[PDB]
Amino acid sequence: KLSPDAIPGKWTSQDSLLGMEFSGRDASGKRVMGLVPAKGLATSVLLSPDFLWDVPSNWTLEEAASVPVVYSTAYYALVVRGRVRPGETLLIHSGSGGVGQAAIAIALSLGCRVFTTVGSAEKRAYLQARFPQLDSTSFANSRDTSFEQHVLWHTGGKGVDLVLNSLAEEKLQASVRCLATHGRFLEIGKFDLSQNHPLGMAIFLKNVTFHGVLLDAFFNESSADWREVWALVQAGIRDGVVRPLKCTVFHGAQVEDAFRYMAQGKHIGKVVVQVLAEEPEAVLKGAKPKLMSAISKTFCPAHKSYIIAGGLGGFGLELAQWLIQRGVQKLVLTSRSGIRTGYQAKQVRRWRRQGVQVQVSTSNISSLEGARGLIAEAAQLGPVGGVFNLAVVLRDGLLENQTPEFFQDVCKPKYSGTLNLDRVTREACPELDYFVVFSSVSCGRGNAGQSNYGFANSAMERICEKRRHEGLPGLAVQWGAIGDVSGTLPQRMASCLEVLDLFLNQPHMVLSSFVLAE
């Protein structure tokens, strides 16, 4: 229901955007509960210390998993934006929900009169148990617009000072009518805001401050303003106001069950996932989290350098874009003519602006000295991590019109280049962990009139097989027809990159991929 890009901050990760809070151990073994823009549901997280509280002694790590997001948003909404003062009467929607409970806890501490809207009778009873200060006249129905009349009755018709609205459509309009003179309306939802629904300005004749609250802004900007909310949450924790919510603990192996349980919408409190059990020790100063079985997907370090021969070509640019998304920050792209088109210039400038240390070169891998120069440049950037070989020269024609010169030209970029790269990589590339060369289905199946292409591709496969036998990385991928950049319909670039992600992890040597016509 929500596009991943809607999350603030240009992530582009295309995955791992499913978490917001956690409670675990710091690198020193300290018990900490944190707040992260994304990538929360994981066995580890990389968070700045400005988003990490300390779990007190009473709390258990299970309880601490609920406080951060809910209490941060409640505090930022009320204290820092609504400037709530003691004695006021504020309306908080969806009391059972986490933010509702946090807001109720904050308000009652100051002394306010609280109106809450719940969904059923069980939630009403639970909230009565939690907060004895709430009377029977402090509840309404949240599934209809009848809370308007209730609040307008028990308030004498004067309304309320604050409205922590989280409902949409007609119910939002009803909440606005409950406001009082000098009122303050705090919108934490994102549906009516997104749809650009109209809001009658007549309400402002009465002094009204219609706020729009998005806590997600702080995570990526406005670091100066954050420390106010952090100080407020810490003060609440030490003073006793901030109380952990109810939790329903699921295990890591059953996360889908937790998601479905949430989707049913029958949870009162918070739903939590137990990635790893808490030890009885106060400070375990452990080494690593327990290992688990996870689907494999490729990533790259930052100190490694990567080389793409013929990277300025069609497939080369898309593969380079893919690699950058996986952490590559030092690249070498080889072409005989360098940059000569607009698309190449656009891509290289974009990557340089992103921070990557791109560097085009004219070191023709066909000549062994050129291969040594290329590897030397890559080293100058940093240790050579991987080498890709996407060079090709095409001189097609039936064997009748073929000549030895055409064979030599077609096989120089691919046959000779791969050999030179292999020799140099063995000589002076000890940290290399990828060696990929791109072949064509013609090598296996045989496409009429591409004999030299077949011979060049077939050689590249033997070198890769031999490398993998001696314990070294090696892989020859046999592609069909790449579409965006035989009886095999072309292939989209996205599908090709997904298949490549699959291939780099397999233990085999030569793998192929194509799409069957009809």
């Binding site: 596009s3 890009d5 809607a6 582009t12 319909l489 292939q491 989209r492 599908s495 799409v515």
Partner: protein
Amino acid sequence: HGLYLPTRVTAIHIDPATHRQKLYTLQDKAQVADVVVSRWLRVTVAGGVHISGLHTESAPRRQQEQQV
């Protein structure tokens, strides 16, 4: 990244007379209209068309994945 479709436009102004005035013939027989996008001011101008306040929302892929 991904395909984005228009959802709202704050204002569009069209003036065919000024449009015909703006057009200038290329060396080939084809006629061309220069365009400028000012992402700061949220205005796109080309010939006699002036689009302002264009809003595009990400659209989930149809995931037909016809290619397997």
